[PDB]
Structure formats: C-alpha cells, structure tokens
C-alpha cells in the first residue's frame, strides 16, 4: 500500500536527522521533520504528491 507523501519524506530523511544529533529522541525527530516539510517549496511537495499519485495508481491496479 502506498505511503502518504508527508511520511515518505519522513522516511527518506529520518536517518540524516538522527545524524545531526544522535541524542535526539523519537518525538524530537518527528517535531523537526515537521519543520523541514514546512520549509519545502510547493514544487518540491508536488514531486512527492506526484510520486504518491503514481504509487496509488499502481497499487489500485493490483
């Protein structure tokens, strides 16, 4: 099943957020990722929305 655009971004970027400060707890990583997504341009977000749209089409055809 396809992953939501916001959280596929969270998966792709989680490790580098931990790399910036390994002492960060899980809830601190999620709070930061929320800020990073907010900083994204609308065209950057559209790439993840396109990817999920392609992901949705494939899964529904199975």
């Amino acid at each position: 099943k396809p992953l939501m655009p916001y959280m596929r971004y969270s998966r792709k970027v989680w490790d580098q957020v931990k790399a910036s400060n390994p002492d960060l707890k899980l809830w601190e990583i999620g709070k930061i990722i929320g800020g990073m997504w907010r900083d994204l341009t609308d065209e950057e977000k559209q790439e993840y929305l396109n990817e999920y749209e392609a992901e949705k089409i494939e899964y529904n055809e199975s």
Side-chain angles (χ1 to χ4, degrees):
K1 195 160 187 181
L3 208 58
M4 223 51 185
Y6 172 88
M7 304 225 89
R8 177 135 208 275
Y9 174 81
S10 315
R11 182 209 84 205
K12 265 193 150 204
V13 86
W14 188 277
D15 294 321
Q16 283 290 308
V17 178
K18 186 161 62 176
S20 64
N21 188 348
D23 287 349
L24 287 176
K25 313 220 154 223
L26 289 169
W27 65 268
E28 315 187 79
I29 301 174
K31 283 265 198 175
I32 289 157
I33 289 182
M36 300 174 53
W37 174 272
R38 183 191 182 189
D39 219 53
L40 287 173
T41 65
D42 293 355
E43 39 273 23
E44 279 169 313
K45 296 179 183 180
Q46 185 57 48
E47 306 193 67
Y48 283 82
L49 202 33
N50 291 340
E51 209 277 359
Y52 163 73
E53 176 70 33
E55 215 158 306
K56 170 206 299 181
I57 293 298
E58 301 151 13
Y59 167 80
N60 291 197
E61 204 45 70
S62 56

